[PDB]
Amino acid sequence: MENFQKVEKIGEGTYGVVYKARNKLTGEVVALKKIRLTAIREISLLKELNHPNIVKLLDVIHTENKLYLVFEFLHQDLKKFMDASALTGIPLPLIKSYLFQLLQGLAFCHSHRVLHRDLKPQNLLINTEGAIKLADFGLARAFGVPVRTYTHEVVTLWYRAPEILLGCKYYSTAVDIWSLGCIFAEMVTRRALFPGDSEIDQLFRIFRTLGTPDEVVWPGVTSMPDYKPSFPKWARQDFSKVVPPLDEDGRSLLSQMLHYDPNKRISAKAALAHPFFQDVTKPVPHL
Ligand SMILES: Cc1nc2ccccn2c1-c1ccnc(Nc2ccc(OC[C@@H](O)CN(C)C)cc2)n1
Numbered sequence: 001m002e003n004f005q006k007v008e009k010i011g012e013g014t015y016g017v018v019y020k021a022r023n024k025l026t027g028e029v030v031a032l033k034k035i036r037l038t039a040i041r042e043i044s045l046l047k048e049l050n051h052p053n054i055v056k057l058l059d060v061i062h063t064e065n066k067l068y069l070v071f072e073f074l075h076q077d078l079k080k081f082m083d084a085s086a087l088t089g090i091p092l093p094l095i096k097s098y099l100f101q102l103l104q105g106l107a108f109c110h111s112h113r114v115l116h117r118d119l120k121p122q123n124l125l126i127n128t129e130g131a132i133k134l135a136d137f138g139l140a141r142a143f144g145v146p147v148r149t150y151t152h153e154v155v156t157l158w159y160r161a162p163e164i165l166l167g168c169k170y171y172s173t174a175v176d177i178w179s180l181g182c183i184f185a186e187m188v189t190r191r192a193l194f195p196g197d198s199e200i201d202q203l204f205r206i207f208r209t210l211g212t213p214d215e216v217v218w219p220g221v222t223s224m225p226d227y228k229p230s231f232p233k234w235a236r237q238d239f240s241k242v243v244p245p246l247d248e249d250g251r252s253l254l255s256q257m258l259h260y261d262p263n264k265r266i267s268a269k270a271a272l273a274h275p276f277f278q279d280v281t282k283p284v285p286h287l
Helices: 039-048 078-084 092-111 139-143 174-189 199-210 248-257 268-272
Strands: 004-012 017-023 029-036 057-063 066-072 124-126 132-134
Touching (some): 004 029, 039 066, 039 139, 078 124, 078 174, 092 124, 092 174, 092 268, 174 268
Antiparallel strands (some): 004 017, 057 066
């Protein structure tokens, strides 16, 4: 910390504040997250989890009842880009590029048995070249996903997999594919797919769109800890209605990313092979 010149506050994460900084000795420009504090061991392991579509974790500094995470610096987050693109939309080829790259990042982490578990537009970071990277990979497993952040902000439920909401204790890499599918839809329509404002509102929003799950589509669902037989039974909607602009390859991939049964939900690796990415390219974003 005596080693970093703080440049400016860039924001507030789930666990702590984030600063743009300059290493006072190497002159490296970084993003510095400061967390007011097994977690150290696990976080420290993430330094080897390196991929072009994962935000580089340069260093972990544990001193004085604080845990500092030193990240490579990216230009901005995807949420801000989506917000600035509200009136016109992010062009389809760029959406497809970002999804392709994000899936590469998931496939890498999942191959090493590391899940994110709390993906959302805010922790997807982009640069001016056309790249997109996943941040905060592995921090959920180390700290848990709390109800409120360190600043008492509500942690969003919009991207939470149904198996998590139904109280499953052992989630799989499928939870990240769900979240990523919800973000995909949001980029395409310029509205959140499932903007729930409580756990049951989140669940019932999913159900009104995808249909109330049963034993036919999801074996074991009725025996999950928070399943109630009294859940209203809603009919499944046609995807044609859910994400309309989107062509059939797009809808096919999204429907497979939103399968109820985690065991049937498409893997990141299988998703990369999907015909939607036949014509994928790497456009430069208009920021
Ligand atoms: C890892 C990480 N966590 C967070 C949490 C909040 C904000 C940033 N981060 C990062 C992080 C890591 C690497 N690079 C970046 N870049 C970055 C830069 C500027 C950003 O925007 C701030 C302004 O656009 C808006 N401001 C007025 C609120 C956001 C992210 N963020």
